[PDB]
Design a protein around this ligand. Structure first.
Ligand SMILES: CCc1c2cc(O)ccc2nn1-c1ccc(O)cc1
Ligand SMILES: CCc1c2cc(O)ccc2nn1-c1ccc(O)cc1
Lengths: 245, 9, 236, 11
């Protein structure tokens, strides 16, 4: 696995080059929001972002070493965590707002258009604030987003001796590499040894909050689906259904 | 499965 | 604040001291399970453990510096994570079984006694197996449990600053334990990350567990205590 | 107004 042989600098550079584009929403700015129309915008966007995510995932070192079955389980597990951490990143420089897209910048009050949404908005906003407080750097962001991809689904594997186990090993080797890379960035940034471990922890603890947000957004998305608020694409339907079985 | 096909590209 | 001045050794000592007891279940092992009895056993147990958890939290350095309201918020957010990491930890040396209590050790398949339960069991066991392969130490475990208490509800809030200061001290404590254990700096940072990433899976399980518990309540498959209903209500 | 957790904490 040539990926295991990468330096920290090579890991960072590869992750930066893999970054997906910032997409635009199909927001028609001279039409009144409804619950249905706002949900449509978010799910239309997500659907287009998913195709770009898949090509990004293929570009994360080690991901293409895994089987097709395992790549699927990993993306199925983490897709919404990844979209949300991207959103929180994009929003870093806009206090009080979520930059879903350059033409779709929403504050919490706009979240109230959709029932149950404001609660999720509020968690995303607080995560954005935390990112700002910590002064999260893009090099750290891309590492974290890659940790989510590799980690979130890693224990929902089963165990078929060597087969499942070595896919698990590999993933952990790669995760260990991203840790080394994170530490490297903080050292190059001049943080002390103590600050390095402290910051490493602060950043990883955020992931527990992103998981929480993904769990609640998946519940919320399921609810919108079950209430015929919005038509989901087959892709999004499949991604959502992976969380009900 | 759509996800499966997309990964194959 | 007095928790900010603890040494690493003294953080561990304090956390080790604050540990709640291992409770027994009421289960009469002369009769087999039903869906209603198993779930009754689980909730009766959790309800008794919750009383001890509140005592334990008050003994977590820095927790008592927080306002009563903040203390409540943290416990409401984290209670099921805390119960589950506990369960994962005592099941650690029983591959394939979940030691809910010394007299209630349930192998994977008994999760099928309750609809929807086996999926949660499978997650719990996978986590136990992870702990095992990492050889999680008790001193590390108590650090992790306290991190959950302090971290899980913090972003849903000077109060925030203190929690982050205490969190830093516990990070300092975990790294101390690993340094003490002979690990290189590189191994120390790799193990710190590995342990903290498990907290993401523990959150996942809590969230899943919460919806299952909610379903079992609506479908009325078992009566829940007032305290447990209240801890449930906090999430919805 | 009278959550059980509240009163358990203040003991
Ligand atoms: C996956 C689309 C989506 C949501 C669905 C919900 O039910 C609630 C909140 C949601 N946010 N998003 C979302 C997040 C980040 C994006 O880049 C696109 C959509
Ligand atoms: C809150 C009791 C409980 C569960 C309820 C569910 O619906 C599903 C799984 C559950 N696990 N537990 C649980 C966890 C740890 C304990 O120490 C005791 C009960």
């Amino acid at each position: 696995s040539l990926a295991l042989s990468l330096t920290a600098d090579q890991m960072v550079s590869a992750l930066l080059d893999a970054e997906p584009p910032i997409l635009y929403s199909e927001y028609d700015p001279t039409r009144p929001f409804s619950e249905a129309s706002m949900m449509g915008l978010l799910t239309n966007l997500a659907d287009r972002e998913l195709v770009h995510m898949i090509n990004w995932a293929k570009r994360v070192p080690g991901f293409v070493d895994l089987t097709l079955h395992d790549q699927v389980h990993l993306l199925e597990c983490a897709w919404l965590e990844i979209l949300m951490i991207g959103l929180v990143w994009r929003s870093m420089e806009h206090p009080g707002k979520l930059l879903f897209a350059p033409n779709l910048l929403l504050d919490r009050n706009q979240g109230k258009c959709v029932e149950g949404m404001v609660e999720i908005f509020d968690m995303l906003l607080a995560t954005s604030s935390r990112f700002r407080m910590m002064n999260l750097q893009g090099e750290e962001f891309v590492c974290l987003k890659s940790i989510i991809l590799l980690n979130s689904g890693v224990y929902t594997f089963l165990s078929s001796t060597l087969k499942s186990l070595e896919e698990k090993d590999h993933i952990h080797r790669v995760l260990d590499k991203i840790t080394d890379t994170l530490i490297h960035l903080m050292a190059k940034a001049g943080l002390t040894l103590q600050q390095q471990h402290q910051r490493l922890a602060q950043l990883l603890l955020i992931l527990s909050h992103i998981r929480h947000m993904s769990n609640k957004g998946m519940e919320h998305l399921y609810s919108m689906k079950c209430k015929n608020v919005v038509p989901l694409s087959d892709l999004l339907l499949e991604m959502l259904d992976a969380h009900r079985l | 499965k759509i996800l499966h096909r997309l990964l194959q590209d």
